[PDB]
């Protein structure tokens, strides 16, 4: 059942018959050889992904599915902070609610509706057999059931150890099986004593058993629009990605421009970075944080463009308290952080670090 449901999800995940033109499976955008992100080039580089029509681009960067199964379901905590959920704006409560959305999105897999999905599942005798064993006879005749079941299988598959193996060097080091290089060790010390820890650690204090390097909260760190992405997505020059406020049922204008803190696991191999893929290099993402702290003019310039970072897409609700730490990361500490973040790469993706290094 647990095994079998995931095994079904495994099959669906790679099955392009879930896209209108049959060109695209989850695996196409969440490619297992790329820590489940999209290696494909589109009109905005790797910032945003192309759908099954071959033309439609999204407005956000395809995130890893690695460790996404550790994220709690979306909720508001007692301190009025939203946490968890799926999608950069948390608009899906959890993996199961998320799974069906790329299928029906005309900018992604573009199936017209649930019935079209179920017709596809019915065409395949392995699916009749697999779905029926788990969900019962005729499940694939009922589009609502078939679609829900396909989401469930896909959520199950993403909860397997294959997606969250905890076998990064960092994991190995925390087991006592090996040691950090001294650069990695300094990186870890910086990470845990600087402001990164205020957002990129599961817990406020104490020790997490399955650390994924995010507190699953929502923060506006004051990123600019990714203009090439925004052009490709076609959403308009006057469009504002309001982040969490876009989630249905969120009305508080203080949530405007806030996005889910990503897990930094496999961060080294899942560029480009941020919700709009705006920064191509990991070092850039780190340096962006100096804009709140450094008094040096260079701290205001995106090193990838040589131009100012740009006005925030959403100039209000910035996390200034956390961001304005009073301390600038010098290059040695940025280098250290890169080294440390690379230790968060799963064992099987270690060979990918060669090219990024």
């Amino acid at each position: 059942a647990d095994d079998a449901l995931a095994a079904l999800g495994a099959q669906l995940f790679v099955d392009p018959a879930l896209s209108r033109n049959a060109t695209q499976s989850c695996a196409t955008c969440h490619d297992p050889a790329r820590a489940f992100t999209d290696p494909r080039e589109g009109k905005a580089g790797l910032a945003v992904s192309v759908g099954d029509d071959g033309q439609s681009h999204g407005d956000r960067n395809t995130p890893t599915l690695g460790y996404a199964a550790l994220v709690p379901a979306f909720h508001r905590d007692a301190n009025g902070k939203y946490k968890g959920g799926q999608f950069w704006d948390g608009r899906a409560d959890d993996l199961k609610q998320q799974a069906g959305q790329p299928m029906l999105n005309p900018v992604q897999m573009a199936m017209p509706d649930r019935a079209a999905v179920a017709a596809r599942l019915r065409d395949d005798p392995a699916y009749r057999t697999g779905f029926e064993a788990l969900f019962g006879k005729g499940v694939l005749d009922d589009p609502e059931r078939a679609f829900d079941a396909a989401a469930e299988a896909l959520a199950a598959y993403q909860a397997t150890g294959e997606f969250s193996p905890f076998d990064s060097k960092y994991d190995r080091v925390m087991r006592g099986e090996e040691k950090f290089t001294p650069l990695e060790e300094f990186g870890y010390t910086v990470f845990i004593t600087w402001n990164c820890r205020l957002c990129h650690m599961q817990r406020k204090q104490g020790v997490a058993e399955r650390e994924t390097f995010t507190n699953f909260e929502y923060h506006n760190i004051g990123l600019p629009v990714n203009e090439t992405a925004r052009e490709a997505s076609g959403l308009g020059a006057d469009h504002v990605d309001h982040g969490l406020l876009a989630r249905p049922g969120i009305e508080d204008p203080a949530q405007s421009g806030r996005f889910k803190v990503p897990s930094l696991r496999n961060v080294a191999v899942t560029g480009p970075y941020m919700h709009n893929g705006v920064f191509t290099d990991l070092r850039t993402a780190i340096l962006f944080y100096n804009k709140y702290t450094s008094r040096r003019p260079e701290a205001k310039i995106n090193p990838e463009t040589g131009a100012p970072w740009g006005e925030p897409e959403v100039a209000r609700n910035l996390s200034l308290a956390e961001l304005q730490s009073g301390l600038m990361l010098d290059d040695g500490r940025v280098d250290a952080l890169v080294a440390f973040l690379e230790t968060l790469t799963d064992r099987r993706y270690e060979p990918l670090l060669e090219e990024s290094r």
């Binding site: 301190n79 817990r203 406020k204 204090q205 104490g206 020790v207 058993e209």
Partner: protein, 376 residues
């Protein structure tokens, strides 16, 4: 048995073992209650000083307020706010002087008002609590000025503004009785009643002279604004009680806190805040020991408790320490607070038995002044 630090170690270990997370944050002080006690440290005339907010029940410091040069603390009896009149200088103890009043929220301890007093008008003296005084409505703070002459300043806490200085005769201390009136003690041996409108010379009315020139009334009388009771010991432990509840002064039978044979064998009051008055118990507490005539600011090791209407001694406690200042919580079963300037320790006593219950040490440099709210 288990101390505060121990209990805390255990709770922290449990949270760790349980994997319980918690957000490091700024705590709020427990709500003000009858057992909250404030200890002010004038720090032997240091330029900056500290006030300790203490939960008398647990004998725990629950917060602190920083102050300037010989600030005058006040605590609203209803627990709604605390305030001080303070003095800072632009370069530690030199330079431009700024006298000001701060009003603080009693649980976040954040200042909610900061009211500058023009022309540096505060009286700088070892801290006498009744040299700065809240009116009963809490809307007005009155502070004493000695230079160039006795005067009283009126500060509007509601509007957050200084109003004006009142000219008074040659008098001292400020015992507000109403939103527009307070009494003072005059050199000629009277009390003066000062009624201030919003304008004009105030109206000033002397009582009879109530003590001779050679009878010395201490700088730290107790005053219960809610009871209207001004309790004023003399050097010999004689105690004037003055009732101001009616709006006018009426002089209660004078009382002796020590017996003739005690006097004769050298017993005299001594210390700083030598006297405490418990309003609901109508009871007086006096710091005493055997001492020479002119050692009247030294610590004492005993407290006598006497009934206010009769004069009857109710207890004599051996404090077990050198005590400079006393006060009491105004609840039922009150604590008797015995502050040792030398030990920098507030000893917290059961006012009934005089037993030492607990203590809070490390209270600055030279703590002298204990204040409580009368919240009941």
């Amino acid at each position: 048995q288990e101390t505060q630090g121990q209990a805390a170690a255990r709770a922290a270990a449990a949270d760790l073992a349980a994997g319980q997370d918690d957000e490091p944050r700024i705590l709020e002080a427990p709500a003000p209650d009858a057992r909250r006690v404030y200890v002010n440290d004038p720090a032997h005339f240091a330029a900056v000083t500290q006030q300790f907010v203490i939960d008398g029940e647990a004998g725990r410091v629950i917060g602190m307020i920083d102050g300037g040069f010989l600030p005058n603390p006040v605590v609203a009896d209803d627990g709604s706010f605390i305030a001080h009149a303070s003095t800072v200088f632009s370069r530690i103890a030199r330079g431009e002087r700024t006298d000001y009043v701060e009003v603080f929220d009693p649980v976040t301890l954040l200042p909610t008002a900061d009211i500058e007093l023009p022309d540096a008008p505060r009286f700088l003296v070892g801290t006498y609590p009744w040299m700065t005084s809240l009116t009963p409505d809490g809307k007005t703070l009155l502070f004493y000025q000695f230079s160039p002459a006795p005067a009283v300043g009126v500060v509007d806490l509601e509007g957050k503004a200084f109003k004006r200085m009142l000219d008074v005769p040659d008098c001292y201390h400020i015992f507000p009785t109403a939103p527009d009136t307070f009494f003072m003690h005059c050199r000629d041996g009277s009390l003066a009643k000062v009624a201030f409108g919003t304008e004009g010379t105030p109206e000033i009315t002397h009582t009879e002279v109530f003590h001779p020139e050679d009878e010395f009334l201490i700088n730290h009388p107790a005053y219960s604004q809610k009871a209207g009771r001004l309790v004023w010991p003399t050097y010999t432990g004689k105690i004037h009680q003055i009732d101001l509840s009616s709006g006018d002064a009426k002089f209660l039978p004078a009382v002796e806190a020590l017996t003739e044979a005690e006097r004769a064998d050298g017993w005299r009051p001594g210390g700083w805040q030598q006297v405490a008055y418990h309003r609901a118990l109508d009871r007086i507490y006096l710091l005493v020991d055997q001492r020479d005539e002119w050692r009247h600011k030294t610590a004492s090791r005993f407290v006598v408790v006497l009934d206010a209407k009769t004069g009857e001694r109710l207890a004599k406690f051996e404090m077990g320490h050198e005590i400079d200042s006393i006060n009491v919580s105004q609840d039922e079963k009150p604590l008797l607070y015995a502050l040792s300037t030398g030990d920098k320790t507030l000893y917290i006593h059961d006012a009934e038995s005089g037993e030492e219950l607990r203590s809070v040490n490390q209270l600055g440099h030279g703590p002298q002044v204990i204040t409580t709210a009368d919240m009941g």
